Amino acid sequence: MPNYKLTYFNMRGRAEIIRYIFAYLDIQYEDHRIEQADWPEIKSTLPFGKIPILEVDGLTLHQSLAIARYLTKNTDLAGNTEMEQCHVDAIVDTLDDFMSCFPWAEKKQDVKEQMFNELLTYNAPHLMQDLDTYLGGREWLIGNSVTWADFYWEICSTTLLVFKPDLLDNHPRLVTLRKKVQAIPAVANWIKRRPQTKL
């Protein structure tokens, strides 16, 4: 076992996927959370100035989805074939493109209201129908067992539900997915233990 040190804001954000993988695989790591006041002092230290980073034996990794992929390679969470690993990556990227559309950094809180409302009213419902069709009559998004794509669905939807809490009212299959992930004893164990933040 190597030693690990995760560094991110005190929020779920883009680090939650990594904490989910860590928890599912039973990997003791350090979850180092910073205040946004300590962000300028640390940004210059970072390779490309963005967070999260994972340190494994003095080696800094960046980019959440690349770290997530790195930590699940050769694990059940990855998918069983290159095609299945491709589908995991397509779903993750698709969810991620939509999570990234939101103007989290927009300082004008008025303008951040508008874009958020539009994406949650026009964009998101279409996407929730694409997932539903894609999932079909499977329990999990890819194959016949959990992958970190499912983890990612749960993480993304948790944060989309905070804003539009009725987002899945016409999609109980996507709610059951959320519950199947929250049912994984290691994941459930961490969902209760984790710090309670909005995002």
Choosing from 12, 14, 19, 69, which is the catalytic residue? 14
Pick one of 30, 38, 113, 130: the residue that binds its own copies (CB under 8 A). Answer: 130
Specify whether 138 is catalytic.
Answer: no
With CB cut-offs between 5 and 8 Å by kind, which of ligand SWS, ligand GSH, its own copies, none does residue 52 bind?
ligand GSH
Cα–Cα distance measured from residue 195 to residue 101, given in angstroms and rounded to the nearest whole number: 26
Our answer to whether residue 14 is catalytic in this structure is yes
**Of 63-71, 106-114, 125-133, 185-193, which segment contacts ligand GSH by CB under 6 A?**
63-71
Select 28 or 196, whichever has its Cβ closest to ligand SWS: 196
Near ligand GSH by CB under 6 A, which window of 62-70, 135-143, 164-172, 179-187?
Answer: 62-70
Choices 25-33, 123-131, 138-146, 152-160 (CB under 8 A): range interacting with its own copies: 123-131
Question: Position 10: which residue type?
Answer: N
Two structure tokens written together for 87: 């589908």
Task: Please report whether residue 94 would count as binding its own copies according to CB under 8 A.
Answer: yes
> Which residues of the chain form contacts with ligand GSH (CB under 6 A)?
13-14, 50-52, 63-65, 97, 105
Residues labelled as active-site residues: 8, 14, 104
